[PDB]
């Protein structure tokens, strides 16, 4: 941890777009959102697409929704 | 991954400093052993291989420690007095393969402040 | 023709062949062999001539081992050349054979064939030979 030279880094909690899965993590992006989960150590909010919260191995707008709404 | 061997790699470093530092009858060698909790000081001459003085945290008395960094300075005060009892005045400092930064360092100034010349 | 693929030095001393053979004086692979009684240089052209004569008599039967190899080279000068001005160009390859060295070995044939195929080969070499068994 040599001072100054290293780039910025700060833990951030992510949420899945499919389920709003609270997922404590770390990143280097503020994402313009901050929540107060686990008060006393505030964490920013950075949303993310499909992840381990609802991963198949582990449809909302565009893709099929246009396909189903058009053809039904 | 193979776990690192802390003491064995030090023996390689201690053999490097021993190529130029040796103890004789007139000027013995002052050696230092540092562990995770204890620091040991010893005075040796290599012409015949005997110990002239020794002091450490395991001494008979004088128990007073703080951060085990000035405890070495307490050790250095005792070894300097014990070594100077028999007339030893000039010695050479053997690092023991360590650095010269903390506990090993602060041991040295304790002897220099007392009746010992490095 | 048995020749080394490459050599470190083109030119070479001639050496000497005094004393009994260093090693290989016992037949190991085959059952019969030619033992040299005298010592002399043996070229690769004499090895080939002795190899064909001994192989042909068996009608390509059995197995044949060659226990020597021409490592050493030798040079020569043309006719009409005075002495001096360097060393001659290499010409051939020899194998200094000391006394007692086994040169060829034979297996896979009856005794009468073995005792006869060896003597046809022994007439192509400049050494006095002998036939020995295991």
């Amino acid at each position: 941890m040599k001072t100054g030279i290293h780039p910025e880094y700060r833990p951030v909690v992510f949420v899945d777009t499919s389920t709003d899965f609270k997922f404590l993590s770390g990143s280097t992006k503020s994402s313009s959102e901050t929540i107060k989960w686990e008060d006393g150590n505030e964490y920013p909010l950075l949303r993310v697409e499909i992840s381990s919260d609802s991963h198949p191995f582990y449809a909302t707008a565009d893709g099929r929704v246009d396909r189903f709404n058009k053809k039904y | 991954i193979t776990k690192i061997d802390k003491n064995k790699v030090r023996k390689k470093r201690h053999a490097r400093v021993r190529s130029k530092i040796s103890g004789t009858e007139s000027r013995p060698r002052l050696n230092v052993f540092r562990s995770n909790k204890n620091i040991y000081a010893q005075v040796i001459d290599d012409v015949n291989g005997v110990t002239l003085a020794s002091a450490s945290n395991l001494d008979k008395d004088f128990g007073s420690a703080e951060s085990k960094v000035d405890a070495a300075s307490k050790v250095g005060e005792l070894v300097a007095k014990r070594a100077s009892e028999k007339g030893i005045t000039s010695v050479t400092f053997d690092r023991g393969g360590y650095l010269y930064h903390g506990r090993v360092k602060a041991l040295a100034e304790a002897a220099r402040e007392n009746g010992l010349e490095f | 023709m048995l020749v080394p693929k490459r050599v470190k030095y083109r030119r070479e001393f001639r050496g000497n062949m005094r004393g009994r053979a260093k090693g290989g004086t016992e037949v190991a692979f085959g059952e019969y062999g030619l033992q040299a009684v005298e010592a002399s240089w043996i070229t690769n052209r004499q090895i080939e001539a002795a190899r064909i004569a001994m192989t042909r008599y068996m009608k390509r039967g059995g197995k044949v081992w060659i226990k020597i190899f021409p490592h050493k080279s030798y040079t020569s000068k043309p006719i009409g050349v005075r002495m001096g001005k360097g060393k001659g160009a290499p010409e051939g390859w020899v194998s200094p054979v000391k006394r007692g060295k086994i040169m060829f070995e034979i297996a896979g044939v009856p005794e009468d064939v073995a005792r006869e195929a060896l003597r046809l080969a022994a007439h192509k070499l400049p050494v006095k030979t002998k036939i020995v068994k295991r």
Partner: protein
């Protein structure tokens, strides 16, 4: 961070039960990881290395260590002196936070993370992932990423043999 809340709490007792270890010190650890990319095409261009090292730093959070060449090779118009690739060797809390996003949001970003990939083991108990697409991590700038080179992710563990090495990553999620 939560991996500490998930490894020490329940993964540690699971290994002892499944393997019958004599003491607790035999439960395998995670020692170090490396991120080696390889930019050997930069032997002629001095602008490719600037972005890739900067991109890797944002992905991990530590300064990349610009490597060099060891031997001179004729057929690649390459010699001694120029940099070839870079690596980052993180350790500590960053060890699990990097894996925290790698096994949660980075893997689904691939076209198909469901590929088992159980043959990538070194044979002593270390797993070396080889994700080459520079889009799995949701931190790298997609538009700003000019080129696309390949990467390596190496997991080294104190697991003596493969079965307990594979077993650990299964409980950690893989």
């Amino acid at each position: 961070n939560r991996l500490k809340d998930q490894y020490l709490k329940e993964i540690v007792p699971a290994l002892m039960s499944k393997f019958n270890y004599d003491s607790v010190m035999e439960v395998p650890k995670i020692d170090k990881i490396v991120i080696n990319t390889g930019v050997g095409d930069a032997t002629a261009n001095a602008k490719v290395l600037d972005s890739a090292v900067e991109e890797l730093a944002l992905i991990t959070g530590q300064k990349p260590v610009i490597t060099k060449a060891k031997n001179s090779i004729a057929g690649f118009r390459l010699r001694e002196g120029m940099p070839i690739g870079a690596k980052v060797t993180l350790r500590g809390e960053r060890m699990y936070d990097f894996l925290d996003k790698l096994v949660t949001v980075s893997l689904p970003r691939v076209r198909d993370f469901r590929g088992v990939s159980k043959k990538a083991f070194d044979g002593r108990g270390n797993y070396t992932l080889g994700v080459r697409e520079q889009l799995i991590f949701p931190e790298i700038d997609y538009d700003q990423v000019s080129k696309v080179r390949g990467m390596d992710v190496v997991i080294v563990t104190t697991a003596k043999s493969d079965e307990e090495s594979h077993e650990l990553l299964t409980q950690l999620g893989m």
